[PDB]
């Protein structure tokens, strides 16, 4: 039930998930730089933070293991907002959840459209290390 497991720096791909500085990244750029002579490593990693968008940064050894987050995706029906902009979600199962918020930027703003329509949605709700949301919205019927 741990949010992140160990990887190998060495066996850290692009476009895999990665912990930079205690946030879940996708690992956007890998090199090497700088080291003893007599066998050690320090892979430059970057990242874009996979909520924020926030780009970070750290230096690892290709020996040891970094911090990689487990990443999770669940789809849910959507069938309420309510004032305080939060929305009603409903699971397969039918357990209903209003924690989480109408999602930044864009998406967001379709998605409030789509729903003051007549559209049934849903909403696809990014999970890792804690945090959650709306990264998606498609319609349904």
Same mark, same amino acid.
């Given at each position: /039930? ?22 879940? #990244? ?14 050690? /490593? ?9 909520? %924020?968008?926030?780009?970070?940064? +750290?230096? #690892? ?13 669940? +789809?849910?029906? $959507? ?12 699971? +397969? %199962?039918? +357990? ?10 864009? $998406? ?20 890792? #290390? ?5 990264? /998606?919205?498609?319609? %349904?019927?």
């Amino acid at each position: /039930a741990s949010a992140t497991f160990p990887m190998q720096c060495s066996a850290l791909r692009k476009n895999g998930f990665v912990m930079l500085k205690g946030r879940p #990244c996708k690992i956007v750029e890998m090199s090497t730089s700088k080291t003893g002579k007599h066998g050690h /490593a320090k892979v430059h990693l970057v990242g874009i933070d996979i909520f %924020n968008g926030k780009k970070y940064e +750290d230096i #690892c050894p290709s020996t040891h293991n970094m911090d990689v987050p487990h990443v999770k995706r669940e +789809d849910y029906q $959507l069938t309420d907002i309510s004032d305080d902009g939060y929305l009603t979600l409903m699971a +397969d %199962n039918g +357990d209903l959840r209003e924690d989480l918020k109408i999602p930044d930027g864009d $998406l967001g703003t379709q998605l409030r459209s789509d729903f003051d329509s007549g559209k049934e949605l849903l909403c696809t709700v990014l999970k890792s #290390c804690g945090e959650e949301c709306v990264i /998606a919205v498609k319609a %349904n019927t």
